[PDB]
Design a protein around this ligand. Structure first.
Ligand SMILES: Nc1ncnc2c1ncn2[C@@H]1O[C@H](COP(=O)(O)OP(=O)(O)O)[C@@H](O)[C@H]1O
Ligand SMILES: Nc1ncnc2c1ncn2[C@@H]1O[C@H](COP(=O)(O)OP(=O)(O)O)[C@@H](O)[C@H]1O
Ligand SMILES: Nc1ncnc2c1ncn2[C@@H]1O[C@H](COP(=O)(O)OP(=O)(O)O)[C@@H](O)[C@H]1O
Ligand SMILES: [Mg+2]
Ligand SMILES: [Mg+2]
Ligand SMILES: [Mg+2]
Lengths: 517, 517, 517
């Protein structure tokens, strides 16, 4: 035939109209969760699985989106989460608004070309205004580093212990953080999270070491070692075989024995190699024969087998040990140190705690809570908390929260509009207005009076200054800086990038061709 | 088309309304089993299996719940059972009730935000008041521990012998109970239950050792050993083979014989290493060749094979014996002591009793009973019995029963309401009123006049003091302390935690998105 | 019967009329993307996968065309992309327009023969006019080469950084460029693109070397070499085996050790051959045994395994190293140089950067961007920018853009129409009119007044000259030469070639016989 049936297509009005609608729908689905007073969502997976969260990234991800334009909104939160960690709801909400105000300009008959260009100018000029209004802080000033982390957690379910969790996140990042060129550089892969049900979120702690979900491989091995000299062996403590096909031909009785003894020997020799270094704790990545388990036990050496490769590396960065491929070449300089390596039964499960490490380059945060749900959400809260701390340490700049920056951008980006003038100025002014859904939906989710409230905020801000935003807890405008309610300068800069590009990318699609599914 | 067809979604009122309804429905399904006079449910699964219990946890679990919000109730009972072991029905009922009174506040148009904050202040203040009014008892007062256990057994079917069971339970937990740092620590995993049909629940006893469902592996071995020196071998008593592939090449007739003999020897040598330690009782985790069996029999040693790893660990803890991987290194110091080790044919089934151990660190409770159901339910009773005894030894605090803690919580929490004031006060007052479903549904299941009866109890309590609660056996208020009817301070502190958490979790969800169920 | 059932057929009018319709349809589909102001399309394939692009080649290829004649319009962009690399839209648009004005002549009863012939003449004469009017430039003029590239990128998405991309594109081709026979010859296979999400498009860069998506094979190997002496081994660094079937037969215990040691040596000997050359970095196409890795690690050599054949060759060309099949013959002369070979983590991804090379005959462009889409589209832009800069260096002849060349071919080709006269004159006249969709649909996509604009231009061009065309950013005619807005003389020559070729191909089909479509 001509073009496959059960294949739809839209152009101009249609195309853009549908795309903007789908985009806006998704955006409004999450805006109900923006801020400290935002709500939660219960996502019921087809397999019966239940996820209750405040996280935009998680929601957009779990929800099965069909419309293409809506899936693109997932990329917004996806990029925001991977660049600033926090503000995923914000980026998607602003992208939807930008598209709503944009369609308005389309209805007015303004060429997409003009809207796009005016949006780009507004987007580019916002980065500029933010880089400018940003409050340059001291990279490790623990004071504000504690605020950033806290402000972040106060936006989710777990704000109940914003105090503790903030502290654990600033402490965790400060430890693994690296600086050898002048500024910091944080590899968050160096902060493992351990979630165990039971207890309260109160019992959550920072383990300047590592936690592994394995047991001590032999009954007779120490279930605890004091000042451990740790060995990370990535070789199988078992009877090696030749790459070349080989088989034994027993020809006389005495051989059954001689051979077995020959292997015990090989086995024991490997173990001996490990002991001679003075190592009392060994984490093996591959397997461990039974005899080798026995010899290791007799030397009073604690051994764990089948360790995840990801675990081995965490152990390496935490204890200072060096992973080794050949036991024969293992030396004491390869061994790492842990103030205590013990096997504890946490919530019925046995785990190995490698704590009290020297100056760990990798750390673990043990999360405790009543239910699976409480745990999962706290991990989420923390990941954002950690990610914002990472931003402030690398950037060294912060901003007030509660829509204070978008209000600055609105008020200001409208002047830029005048200067630009023309059709573009229309897009620029609309862009500046779209930016108000943050202060707006913040006061809305809080039960406040959207209309009236949004008037006081722009009032104060115009008077008092850059620090004026809305405090959902106060129910009125306030100086966010004096209240220590702040956020990373990177989180805002990135929301604007993510949203404006998602907006412009849609304002550019004049034809949609979807086949049959 | 944002979502796939066949996907349902609800928002605002709908969401909450349905969640609360599904929660309340499940709650009312179990409330009929609350207290001593509670009723039992019969659960028939698709496979035809029939379960008859009073236990909330089993019911919420066996029943196939589908609505999401209703499953989040299963979690409440799960957390409760994993923390205080008892009060599962109580936590679930107070959750459904907390939500019902919560919706009433929603109907009045009170922002969910307000209800959540007020419910949190109520839950927080409730803990505080419980910590206070808590009757601090002596961590090992045989007296109150015998009570806590009995008050518990009386709530279920098994109260006919609340006498025996409560004794077996306090006795059993005291034996395995471990302390050496000041306070007790109980690992209930060191208490195994053994259920056997026949006889009367009366024949249930505490074996200060371990019962194993295996038989003496050889005909000619001893079926009974006085003062046994016990060996725990976790190695196979069979012809070892090399890791490296190998095969025998018989070249001459005289080889057939000599090779077999060479294996008999290997076998006998292993048996010899065991006999030379003095051990007359061997429990092997793996298998035992037929010859190793024969040699073991000649030395008059009693052996059992294929012993469960969980069993080995118990015999190890119960007899002081150490588990060995190599028979070559078994010393007499690895052996353990059991006053008597005998194979008894308990109800047509052969089993092995290791009794009269020195000081057990693990102990078994043998359960007898007419039917399979009698047995199962008694075990369930015992489990909550052992779990509450564990609570007091670790906590050292108790409270009166019959909803007396809640009546006190109600009266007191309400005052708190006044001082807090505002809309929160409406939430607090309601939270407090919700707690009354315990006394309420206790009198109800009993068959008493709820309305009237609940007026009396709140009266007595206001006068006579914190110990006044309802006594379903008295049909009137009573001083629960003088009656000896009490429960762990943990059970109540945990009910409030669980229920209030769940109530708030659900009160936060303003959107539900589901696929296939 | 005669012909298979469900087999359609068309003749004369039908056949030709349908084919021309199908062809025109596809053409009108892509024309909305032509030029700087062209719009993008959203393509959702059967598996939900989303492709958002401006590229014609991609759109015709992703869309599932069913009609035969429309599938042939794909070959047009296919051929165009393969010979000039740019103007794929231009070629398809002109080919449909050609087929339109051609049907007019068919309706007029002019025999297909006359149209084909007059079209072939209009095409032959078209090249002639181009080769002539062509603005001959210096094969390596840095100036114009930057223009040709920036002009190409402007017509797409990433024109927001036309600046940078232009630069990288010129450098990249100059480097890999080969010219010993007088003029240049560029093998674009020597330019590899590397896409990694994250950062801005600002961070995109040129890597005078290669970038490989592999990591260092052993934990103990250097993660960075300063003045690498790279070795390229296409041999498996593992225990070799005889082609003839073989198997070791162990006949005594000492053998288990002697045989493993024999293989260790073999392995160690290969690594010795690699080290004895002074090579501190080795890339191996096949695998590397575990021991071979250990020796390699001890010697302080950085090794990578399983490297792509395509990568090996890019390294050979980037470093000057020679690939080797037998380590035994590796010499220091087979090694290459790299100012730095380091393993970096880009987007949580581990990659090896062989940068700083001497005179790389192969080079890599690293593409950075917010979303997956941003990147894929920037790569597309670069492939065109690089393919056009390739044409200019090999051809050394540019042209003005903005339809300037087509307007010139139109005016001119009409004269030719006169002198040829007769029926063919009508075909040559219509062919020259067809070439106007370019200036037409450029002004249209821009949102200008087609009719009116197309007149100011045919005018200005007539009075000012060859360099007059439409400037979509200017919204009016302009001298494309003064604006630097130009394109390869090859792009235009191949467009005409491709279009007319196709148009005539369809005009010659008077019967279509299909089985199922
Ligand atoms: N105390 C506060 N009062 C009002 N708004 C706040 C307060 N704290 C944080 N916010 C705002 O709430 C938003 C973050 O809400 P959240 O639910 O976490 O979504 P997101 O994914 O965008 O971080 C930010 O705009 C932030 O400024
Ligand atoms: N003799 C009694 N008189 C009145 N109430 C009692 C008595 N014994 C126990 N209760 C109450 O019954 C409740 C426990 O009932 P039960 O069916 O076992 O459910 P749960 O899972 O909550 O333990 C507790 O609130 C407790 O105070
Ligand atoms: N600044 C400009 N103003 C008007 N037309 C331009 C400009 N730059 C390039 N063009 C034209 O746009 C066309 C290329 O647009 P493009 O979208 O890349 O499609 P194609 O596949 O034909 O390259 C060419 O005809 C070219 O002359
Ligand atoms: Mg957040
Ligand atoms: Mg009970
Ligand atoms: Mg182009």
């Amino acid at each position: 035939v001509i073009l496959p049936e059960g294949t739809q297509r839209y152009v101009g009005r249609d195309a853009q109209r549908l795309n903007i609608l789908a985009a806006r729908i998704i955006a409004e689905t999450v805006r109900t969760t923006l801020g400290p007073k935002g709500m939660d969502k219960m996502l019921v997976d087809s397999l019966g699985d239940i996820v209750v969260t405040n996280d935009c990234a998680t929601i957009l991800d779990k929800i099965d989106l069909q419309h293409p334009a809506a899936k693109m909104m997932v990329e917004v939160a996806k990029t925001q989460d991977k660049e600033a960690g926090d503000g995923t709801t914000t980026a998607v909400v602003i992208a939807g608004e930008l598209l709503r105000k944009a369609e308005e300009l389309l209805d007015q008959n303004i060429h997409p070309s003009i809207i796009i260009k005016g949006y780009a100018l507004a987007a580019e000029k916002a980065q500029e205004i933010l880089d400018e209004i940003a409050i340059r802080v001291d990279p490790d000033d623990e004071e504000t580093l504690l605020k950033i982390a806290a402000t972040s957690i106060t936006g989710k379910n777990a704000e109940s212990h914003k105090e503790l969790l903030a502290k654990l996140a600033v402490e965790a990042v400060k430890q693994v953080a690296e600086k050898k060129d002048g500024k910091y550089v944080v590899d968050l892969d160096n902060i493992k999270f351990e979630k165990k049900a039971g207890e309260g979120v109160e019992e959550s702690e920072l383990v300047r070491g590592v936690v592994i979900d394995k047991e001590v491989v032999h009954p007779r091995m120490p279930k605890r070692v004091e000042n451990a000299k740790i060995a990370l062996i990535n070789e199988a403590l078992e009877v090696k075989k030749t790459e070349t096909d080989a088989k034994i031909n027993i020809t006389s009785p005495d051989q059954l024995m001689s051979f077995l003894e020959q292997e015990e020997k090989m086995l024991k020799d490997m173990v001996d190699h490990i002991a001679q270094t003075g190592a009392n704790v060994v984490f093996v990545q591959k397997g461990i024969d039974d005899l080798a388990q026995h010899y290791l036990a007799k030397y009073g050496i604690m051994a764990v087998r089948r360790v995840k490769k990801s675990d081995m590396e965490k152990l390496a960065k935490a204890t200072g040990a060096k992973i080794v491929t050949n036991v024969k070449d293992l030396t004491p300089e390869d061994l790492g140190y842990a103030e205590v390596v013990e096997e504890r039964k946490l919530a019925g499960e046995n785990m190995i705690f490698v704590e009290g490490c020297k100056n760990p380059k990798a750390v673990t945060i043990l999360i405790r809570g009543g239910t699976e749900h409480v745990i999962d959400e706290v991990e989420r809260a923390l990941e954002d908390a950690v990610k914002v701390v990472k931003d402030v340490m690398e950037d060294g700049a912060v901003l007030p929260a509660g829509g204070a920056p978008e209000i600055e951008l609105a008020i200001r980006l409208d002047e830029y509009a005048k200067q630009v003038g023309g059709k573009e100025a229309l897009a620029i002014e609309n862009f500046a207005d779209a930016l108000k859904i943050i202060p707006k939906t913040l006061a809305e989710n809080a039960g406040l009076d959207t209309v009236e409230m949004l008037v006081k905020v722009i009032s104060e801000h115009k008077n008092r200054g850059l620090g004026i935003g809305i405090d959902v807890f106060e129910g009125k405008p306030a100086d966010m800086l004096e209240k220590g309610i702040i956020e990373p300068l990177r989180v805002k800069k990135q929301a604007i990038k993510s949203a404006s590009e998602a907006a412009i990318m849609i304002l550019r699609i004049d034809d949609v061709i979807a086949a049959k599914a």
